[PDB]
Amino acid sequence: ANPYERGPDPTESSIEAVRGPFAVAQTTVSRLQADGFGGGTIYYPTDTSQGTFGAVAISPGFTAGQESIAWLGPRIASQGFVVITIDTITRLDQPDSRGRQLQAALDHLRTNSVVRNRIDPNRMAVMGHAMGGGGALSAAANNTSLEAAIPLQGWHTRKNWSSVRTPTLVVGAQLDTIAPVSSHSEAFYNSLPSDLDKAYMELRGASHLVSNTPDTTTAKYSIAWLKRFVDDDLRYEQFLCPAPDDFAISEYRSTCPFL
Ligand SMILES: [Mg+2]
């Protein structure tokens, strides 16, 4: 019996839902209260009766604020996660810095009075959009204990991610002209270790800014990935292996079976 399983058995509809089975509450971390990042919003399940939850930190991209990623916070948290959407120290911070700030945001959750008793501090993940996705890769590349990483239209000057030991879902936008997949997302997938649990999901017809408003394909497979690897929840492998056949996906490849 997997002690980290939360919520009822999933369906495609349940992972597409704008809100999952867990009611969510939120608390704000001010910039003055945030050591090593720019503040943020923490979304968490109020129901404690099934146990503690894994934690996820999400970074926006260059010049962007929390607003651009906020919709991910409650949508993911309501599936059974404590999720912090961050602001960065400055709007101009580059990817390695954003990765360090993602780690700082996770470290913050460990002692946050509102959520300390709701998180399993051993089970943590990182996500981000654009330079924030490069940040998520960098955070994993500097911390092999992270359980999942999800760069969304990630941008980074570093193309070699052989240091990453964290299961990673690389989400590309087919028509991205800012972080084009051929030189960013797909290059990242290809240099992640060949034996890592990993996947590349390309969003058909999508531009760079697909992640800045609700996108059901992004949410449903981000949720499945976090469930599968932050919770070791084998009930979600069905959505990842074999490749999704959604029309909204133009390309997909993975190191399935994860088991
Ligand atoms: Mg289908």
Numbering used by the authors: 2 to 260
Give the article text.
The recently discovered metagenomic-derived polyester hydrolase PHL7 is able to efficiently degrade amorphous polyethylene terephthalate (PET) in post-consumer plastic waste. PHL7 is a thermophilic polyester hydrolase isolated from a plant compost metagenome along with six homologs (PHL1-6). It rapidly hydrolyzes amorphous PET at 70 °C yielding terephthalic acid (TPA) and ethylene glycol (EG), outperforming all previously reported PET-hydrolytic enzymes, including engineered variants. All polyester hydrolases share an α/β-hydrolase structure with a canonical catalytic triad comprised of serine, histidine and aspartate.
We cocrystallized the inactive variant PHL7 S131A along with the PET hydrolysis product TPA. Addition of Ca2+ or Mg2+ improves the thermostability of PHL7 by up to 7 °C4. In a crystal structure of PHL7 that was obtained in the presence of 10 mM Mg2+ ions, we identified a magnesium-binding site comprised of E13, D246 and D247. The Mg2+ ion is complexed by the carboxyl sidechain of D246 and five water molecules in the first interaction shell forming an octahedral geometry. Three of the five water molecules in turn interact with the sidechains of E13, D246, and D247 while the other two are only coordinated by the divalent metal ion. This Mg2+-binding site of PHL7 resembles a Zn2+-binding site identified in the thermophilic homolog Cut190 (binding site 4), which was described as a site unrelated to PET-hydrolytic activity. In summary, two metal binding sites have been identified at the surface of PHL7. Similar to previous studies on other polyester hydrolases, these may as well serve as future mutagenesis targets to increase the thermal stability of PHL7. The two metal binding sites are 26 Å apart and may act independently and thus in an additive manner to increase protein stability.
